[PDB]
Amino acid sequence: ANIDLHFHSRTSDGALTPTEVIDRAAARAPALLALTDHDCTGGLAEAAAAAARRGIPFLNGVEVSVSWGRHTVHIVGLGIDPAEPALAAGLKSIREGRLERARQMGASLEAAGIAGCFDGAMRWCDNPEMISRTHFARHLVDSGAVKDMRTVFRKYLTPGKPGYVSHQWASLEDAVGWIVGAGGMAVIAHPGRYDMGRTLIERLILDFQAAGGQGIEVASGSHSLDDMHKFALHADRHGLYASSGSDFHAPGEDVGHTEDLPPICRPIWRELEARILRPADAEN
Numbered sequence: 019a020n021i022d023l024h025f026h027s028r029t030s031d032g033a034l035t036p037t038e039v040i041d042r043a044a045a046r047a048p049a050l051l052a053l054t055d056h057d058c059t060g061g062l063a064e065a066a067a068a069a070a071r072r073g074i075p076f077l078n079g080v081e082v083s084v085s086w087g088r089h090t091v092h093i094v095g096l097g098i099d100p101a102e103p104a105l106a107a108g109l110k111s112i113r114e115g116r117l118e119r120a121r122q123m124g125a126s127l128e129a130a131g132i133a134g135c136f137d138g139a140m141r142w143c144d145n146p147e148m149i150s151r152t153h154f155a156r157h158l159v160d161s162g163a164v165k166d167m168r169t170v171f172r173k174y175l176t177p178g179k180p181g182y183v184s185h186q187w188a189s190l191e192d193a194v195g196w197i198v199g200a201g202g203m204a205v206i207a208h209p210g211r212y213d214m215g216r217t218l219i220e221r222l223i224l225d226f227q228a229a230g231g232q233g234i235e236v237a238s239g240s241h242s243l244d245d246m247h248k249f250a251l252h253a254d255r256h257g258l259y260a261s262s263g264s265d266f267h268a269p270g271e272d273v274g275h276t277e278d279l280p281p282i283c284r285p286i287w288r289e290l291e292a293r294i295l296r297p298a299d300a301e302n
């Protein structure tokens with residue numbers, strides 16, 4: 019499929035600027051794109067301009083960090099108005115503790131025998147307030163402390179390992195409501211990554227829907243084919259719309275393309291058509 023509704027830019031943890039990531043996606047002749055940076059909309063105006071210039075329909079997007087019980091989950095919004103005040107304030111409240119947490123992650127790694135990780139991570143991060151475990155991982159790989167990204171999260175930056183600092187993100191109710199109140203659809207991102215069996219997934223979906231959630235990622239760069247099959251069925255039982263995204267961050271860690279949705283799925287983009295920013299001004 020030539021649709022991609024999930025990816026990142028230097029606004030949060032992606033390696034490419036909003037212009038660069040859109041331009042890269044554009045090589046695949048995509049029919050629709052949505053930039054979804056973590057807990058931030060700062061790249062949307064640039065991404066929109068870059069998409070329109072290449073003749074590509076575009077949706078405003080975001081990826082919101084949520085703590086649900088002991089789990090961190092990510093809720094994507096699509097078709098949001100980033101200027102809506104409640105959403106803007108909510109996202110800001112989620113970013114607030116990020117820098118503090120990062121200094122602590124660095125100090126944790128230092129206690130475990132790797133000094134200089136906060137500073138190193140910062141070298142990879144254009145916007146200090148968006149500082150992320152992703153930047154720490156790039157540092158650990160680039161500086162040769164760890165051989166690759168996969169090995170980083172095996173030894174570090176996860177619960178019980180040096181560099182991980184527990185943190186409370188948005189509530190599920192807040193994340194979904196901010197998205198919906200901004201005119202968008204809320205989407206459970208990359209559900210196959212969560213440590214949950216079919217019972218917890220069902221519980222998450224029910225809570226998600228109660229809060230106003232309508233969508234779930236079925237095609238995802240983070241999903242196996244078995245994942246796609248399994249989450250297509252979860253979506254169908256609850257009447258959720260299916261989203262697709264690459265979750266692209268960097269080259270060699272692709273944007274503008276996703277796996278075709280299973281036939282059972284109701285594609286979320288069909289429901290977002292009124293929120294699509296069209297390349298032709300007159301069509302908006």
Ligand SMILES: Nc1ncnc2c1ncn2[C@@H]1O[C@H](COP(=O)(O)O)[C@@H](O)[C@H]1O
Pocket residue numbers: 031056083149150151152167168171267
């Ligand atoms: N196992 C993993 N492999 C690669 N990247 C990861 C992994 N786990 C987390 N990340 C990245 O780290 C980000 C989370 O950082 P933060 O929001 O500061 O906790 C995610 O959005 C991913 O980009």
Ligand SMILES: [Mn+2]
Pocket residue numbers: 026031056152267
């Ligand atoms: Mn990320």
Ligand SMILES: [Mn+2]
Pocket residue numbers: 081092207208
């Ligand atoms: Mn995510």
Ligand SMILES: [Mn+2]
Pocket residue numbers: 024025026081265
């Ligand atoms: Mn993501």
